[PDB]
Enzyme design. Structure first.
Site, mmCIF file in Angstrom:
data_model
loop_
_atom_site.group_PDB
_atom_site.id
_atom_site.type_symbol
_atom_site.label_atom_id
_atom_site.label_comp_id
_atom_site.label_asym_id
_atom_site.label_seq_id
_atom_site.Cartn_x
_atom_site.Cartn_y
_atom_site.Cartn_z
ATOM 1 N NE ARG A 1 2.869 -9.099 21.143
ATOM 2 C CZ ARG A 1 3.092 -7.859 20.727
ATOM 3 N NH1 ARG A 1 2.773 -6.829 21.507
ATOM 4 N NH2 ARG A 1 3.641 -7.651 19.536
ATOM 5 C CB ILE B 1 -0.923 0.040 1.233
ATOM 6 C CG1 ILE B 1 -1.918 -1.122 1.199
ATOM 7 C CG2 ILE B 1 -1.642 1.404 1.323
ATOM 8 C CD1 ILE B 1 -2.963 -1.034 2.255
ATOM 9 C CD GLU C 1 -0.029 -4.109 14.629
ATOM 10 O OE1 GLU C 1 0.493 -4.869 13.810
ATOM 11 O OE2 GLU C 1 0.641 -3.388 15.397
HETATM 12 N N1 LIG Z 1 0.915 -4.479 2.748
HETATM 13 C C1 LIG Z 1 1.701 -3.504 3.252
HETATM 14 N N2 LIG Z 1 1.872 -2.352 2.569
HETATM 15 C C2 LIG Z 1 2.647 -1.359 3.058
HETATM 16 N N3 LIG Z 1 3.308 -1.435 4.226
HETATM 17 C C3 LIG Z 1 3.206 -2.546 5.008
HETATM 18 C C4 LIG Z 1 2.383 -3.666 4.556
HETATM 19 N N4 LIG Z 1 2.453 -4.619 5.522
HETATM 20 C C5 LIG Z 1 3.268 -4.151 6.499
HETATM 21 N N5 LIG Z 1 3.705 -2.902 6.190
HETATM 22 C C6 LIG Z 1 4.613 -2.047 7.003
HETATM 23 O O1 LIG Z 1 5.167 -2.874 8.018
HETATM 24 C C7 LIG Z 1 4.686 -2.442 9.297
HETATM 25 C C8 LIG Z 1 4.340 -3.617 10.201
HETATM 26 O O2 LIG Z 1 3.568 -4.582 9.490
HETATM 27 P P1 LIG Z 1 3.164 -5.948 10.238
HETATM 28 O O3 LIG Z 1 2.522 -6.821 9.173
HETATM 29 O O4 LIG Z 1 2.354 -5.515 11.432
HETATM 30 O O5 LIG Z 1 4.605 -6.473 10.700
HETATM 31 P P2 LIG Z 1 5.032 -7.054 12.147
HETATM 32 O O6 LIG Z 1 4.374 -8.427 12.287
HETATM 33 O O7 LIG Z 1 6.524 -7.190 11.982
HETATM 34 O O8 LIG Z 1 4.649 -6.055 13.199
HETATM 35 C C9 LIG Z 1 3.446 -1.628 9.015
HETATM 36 O O9 LIG Z 1 3.155 -0.728 10.099
HETATM 37 C C10 LIG Z 1 3.825 -0.953 7.723
HETATM 38 O O10 LIG Z 1 4.746 0.112 8.006
HETATM 39 MG MG LIG Z 2 2.556 -5.485 13.508
#
Ligand SMILES: Nc1ncnc2c1ncn2[C@@H]1O[C@H](COP(=O)(O)OP(=O)(O)O)[C@@H](O)[C@H]1O
Ligand SMILES: [Mg+2]
Ligand SMILES: Nc1ncnc2c1ncn2[C@@H]1O[C@H](COP(=O)(O)OP(=O)(O)O)[C@@H](O)[C@H]1O
Ligand SMILES: [Mg+2]
Lengths: 443, 445
Positions: free
Chosen positions: B295, B206, B278
């Site tokens: 959690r 995104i 999230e």
């Molecule tokens: N589909 C996506 N498009 C753009 N940025 C992403 C996407 N997925 C994750 N991110 C980036 O990675 C960060 C954490 O994603 P997440 O899936 O929650 O990883 P984690 O499990 O390491 O916390 C997001 O806050 C965003 O900055």
């Molecule tokens: Mg995360």
């Protein structure tokens, strides 16, 4: 109208308290210090700080020309007086206006109406506020006291008209003791206040001391910010305060709030002020005095109300309207414990260097202190270390939060009243709200 | 009741251990702490009802030693364990072992935790629940050739993500097919090392996203409440530095739909305890689930200040079999911001371990400094660079930003570097003030 720069004509915890609100509002905070206070924490945070003279305790802080010259050199357009020092000095208030400096507080006229405690009662009577039966203004002398005491009935209390800080009062149980007590109080009053005018009222046994916080604005509106119970006193001076006062039922609470509002409006009060009442066993209440300034314990009212009282004081001084009473929501329960550098049994001062300082923190815990590790506390002059304030959803939860917070306060190098407060939090009489202003005297 | 908890072992360290201890003790329950030998100097050990040494230190290793943790609980007669975040908080084996030893794990069931733990399968669970997710692979990628085929199907740019991923690790953004194979193996190898599982999935990347998450809590009766949403978009390495609530990016209609979605999602998986959904929000204000943390999270204090709820108190009550307060009783007011103060250089973000020779925390009305540090404490920035979380609340966002600057200014720390000056420059940054940033802002600046 708008105030750009405020000189804080005070020291210690209240200086730091004021500075925070002033800077958050985007205004300049100007501090002053005697040479003895060059180590004060808030000086690090101020936009500018001016040394106003030699220690001699309060002396330089009471030096009006020095305070005025500091405001002028720093280009402050207003002065925040806090409490103590010059906050009730009518001369200072007039001198501020002479130098086109805004005094953040009430008019000199309003202050003058409530400054002689015996005359203040007469003003309150005129306004329809209940007062304790006693002399009609000042006693002419000891013979007048004798005649009156018999009329109202013992016990009575002799009080200094210019009195404050709990000094110049004597409770008298019998006629045989009266003349001696009169002169004892009169002498103390003369020494402490330069005025030995005495008055008399009925002595209420085991009263609760309950006060109402008000703020009035230049439009004639006055709001309350709830009431505080300050009955846990030693030597007629407060150690623990709380809001609300759970002693009161909602009807009496309402009547008390109304009475305070009515009184403030009758005297044209503007700024923050407090009406102090004694409440008896059948919940009758009586005005005993008004403080025409902020008080030490104001944070407890801030916690239950969501209001920054100093912010409102400043806004009122700038010509803004207060929020409506309807918008003021009082929720939950707040308790404050005054932590001082004194032995928790003897209450004798414990001056010295703080070699360890770890304050408590956490959700809804507010430690109001200018202390820090390595700071030297001059307990002989200011024994105040800090005010520990907590808020919770009800009184029992507040007591539990206070207990944890007190436990987590770690201070070494000097004695403090931490253990006194911890013993009060576990005291069934405190928990059950079974005490009064004389509780500590008989325990 | 029969399920009333008397004694809680805190299976964690640092700021979260102190945070949990305060609530536990305020509730009148015993707080039992554990520590590795390296943490003998931790402040909360002074406050605990009892403290057990559980190992040499390594780093997290003793804290990850299940037999040592269980044995500490039993010697101390704790009937429940609070896991905090990190460490064993999402360890399904630990959760089952707690139950085997008749110790209540303060958290969700192992079944709900298992539904969400594989991030690729989690998305399928969410889709079935009617929750929007980002278009991508249907579960895990079979490999690099599958990734190449899918990426054309969904369209570049795409992001490869580790199914077992966490902490911002095992993800690679891929903008063109030429880079794909190398990125795939880079992420997969990183994931294998970090999580012991190299399973990858893919979704659309995104553009300029905002990271907005909803705090929920569920009880054993099936009630789920939300405690508002947090915007955590100011990130470095996909890890959060500043969080706030509410997310003023959203209008009311969207915020309502977001809250509803989180409640629906939690009910669909039978979730009990605190957790966070999230989401990423795109330029059109459409939101998409990316993962659930089963959690408490680091930034929970933000939600406490706007809601008046003690989240850890509610987690404990739920574990004791109580019903949550009604959603109607939850009032969200004002605006809260949290800045994570770490022992790192404000410009380079490189660790600055060492002894704190001066420590004066900010205080004041509606200022909450969440920290286990104290003057003379040595910070092991190489292992945990956290100093504390500075949290403020005010009546609106600009007032909160002003209060944060005053509080940051009054934080005095000497002997080590901190990110205080970084946060001060963020509070004075017009893009922050104007709400014009995203998860990649710090990377472009
Ligand atoms: N589909 C996506 N498009 C753009 N940025 C992403 C996407 N997925 C994750 N991110 C980036 O990675 C960060 C954490 O994603 P997440 O899936 O929650 O990883 P984690 O499990 O390491 O916390 C997001 O806050 C965003 O900055
Ligand atoms: Mg995360
Ligand atoms: N009429 C009274 N009866 C009983 N106690 C009194 C009376 N007046 C004052 N006190 C005691 O003295 C305290 C302070 O009285 P106040 O008149 O406010 O003195 P000050 O101006 O020194 O503060 C009260 O809280 C109460 O403890
Ligand atoms: Mg008084």
């Amino acid at each position: 109208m708008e105030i750009k720069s405020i000189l804080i004509a005070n020291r210690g915890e209240i200086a730091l308290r004021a500075l925070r609100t002033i800077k958050e509002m985007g205004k300049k905070a100007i501090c002053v210090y005697s040479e003895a206070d060059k180590d004060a924490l808030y000086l690090k945070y101020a936009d500018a700080s001016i040394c106003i003279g030699k220690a001699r305790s309060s002396e330089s802080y009471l030096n009006i020309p020095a305070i005025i010259a500091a405001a002028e050199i720093a280009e402050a357009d207003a002065i925040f007086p806090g409490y103590g020092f010059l906050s009730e000095n009518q001369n200072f208030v007039e001198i501020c206006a002479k130098h086109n400096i805004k005094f953040i507080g009430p008019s000199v006229e309003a202050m003058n109406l409530m400054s002689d405690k015996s005359k203040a009662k007469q003003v309150m009577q005129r306004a329809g506020v209940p007062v304790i039966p006693g002399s009609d203004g000042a006693l002419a002398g000891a013979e007048a006291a004798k005649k009156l005491a018999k009329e109202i009935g013992y016990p009575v209390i002799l009080k200094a008209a210019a009195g404050g800080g709990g000094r110049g009062m004597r409770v008298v149980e019998n006629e045989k003791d009266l003349e001696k007590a009169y002169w004892s109080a009169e002498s103390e009053a003369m020494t402490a206040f330069g005025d030995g005018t005495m008055y008399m009222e009925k002595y209420i046994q085991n009263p609760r001391h309950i006060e109402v916080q008000v703020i009035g604005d230049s439009f004639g509106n006055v709001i309350h910010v709830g009431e505080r119970d300050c009955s846990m006193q030693r030597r007629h001076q407060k150690l623990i305060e709380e809001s609300p006062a759970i002693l009161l039922d909602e009807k009496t609470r309402t009547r008390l709030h109304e009475t305070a509002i009515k009184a403030a409006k009758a005297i044209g009060y503007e700024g923050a002020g407090t009406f102090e009442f004694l409440v008896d066993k059948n919940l009758d209440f009586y005005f005993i005095e008004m403080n025409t300034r902020l008080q030490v314990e104001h944070c407890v009212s801030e916690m239950v109300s969501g209001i920054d009282i100093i912010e409102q004081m400043i806004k009122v001084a700038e010509g803004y309207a207060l929020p409506s009473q309807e918008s003021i929501k009082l929720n939950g329960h707040s308790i404050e414990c005054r932590i001082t550098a004194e032995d928790s049994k003897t209450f004798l001062p414990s001056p010295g260097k703080i070699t360890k300082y770890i304050p408590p923190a956490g959700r809804n815990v507010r430690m109001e202190s200018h202390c820090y590790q390595d700071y030297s506390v001059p307990a002989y002059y200011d024994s105040m270390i800090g005010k520990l304030v907590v808020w919770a959803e009800d009184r029992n939860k507040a007591i539990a939060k206070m207990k944890v917070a007190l436990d987590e306060l770690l201070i070494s190098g000097i004695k403090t009243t931490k253990d006194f407060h911890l013993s009060m939090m576990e005291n069934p009489d405190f928990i059950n709200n079974n005490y009064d202003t004389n509780y500590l005297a008989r325990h």
